[PDB]
């Protein structure tokens, strides 16, 4: 069984739980406000910063290299633009760093520094989601908060280097199947992907609690 299929099958149930989390449920209803959106985007800034820092550390490592797509996927630069938009010129010292966010970042550095062979699980969970449900959220966010089609404030959800996300995802899944794979690595990677989904669910549950 190819890794791409193993990952889809391994995370299909927790995905349902994540897509139906209270924060996302409200988001999908269009009940997202500036305060809530700033909280999640600021948390993603910390998360993607840590993820991409570990990706850079392991870009030459064969256990990850085939999936090294900085130009097409990396979000840090986009998030820095969004942070300046939502938080202003001094966003660096204005944005929050919640406990759930720190926990996520913590696991990211553990994987990147000690278990690099599992890094693919974390890139898969965030990036492929960004190119799927993330595109739906972008549309909802634009309508709910009156964000311009010009993209300001939603740079994170925009991939100017990917003409067709559907096609890119297929390329990505295929590339995931070229990584050196053993029963040991395959089992652990699917396990870490489930953990990645849980870290996201816990972030959303936390943010929702902070807002309510
Ligand atoms: C906001 C609610 C969500 C919606 C509307 C949504 C919707 C979708 C849809 C329609 C697909 C299928 C795309 C395809 O076959 O190419 C998908 C795939 C995916 N989603 Fe979500 N999603 C949501 C939440 C999430 C969350 C919170 C995560 C984890 C951060 C996530 C990560 C993924 C991943 C990793 C895939 C790719 C699965 C695969 O093809 O192996 N999604 N999502």
From Swiss-Prot:
A soluble form arises by proteolytic removal of the membrane anchor. It catalyses: heme b + 3 reduced [NADPH--hemoprotein reductase] + 3 O2 = biliverdin IXalpha + CO + Fe(2+) + 3 oxidized [NADPH--hemoprotein reductase] + 3 H2O + H(+). Inhibited by metalloporphyrins such as Sn- and Zn-protoporphyrins. Its EC number is 1.14.14.18. Induction: Induced by its substrate heme and CoCl2. This is Heme oxygenase 1. Residues 1-212 are cytoplasmic. The keyword Endoplasmic reticulum applies. The lineage of its organism: Eukaryota, Metazoa, Chordata, Craniata, Vertebrata. It comes from Rattus norvegicus. The chain holds residues 11 to 222 of 289 of the full protein.
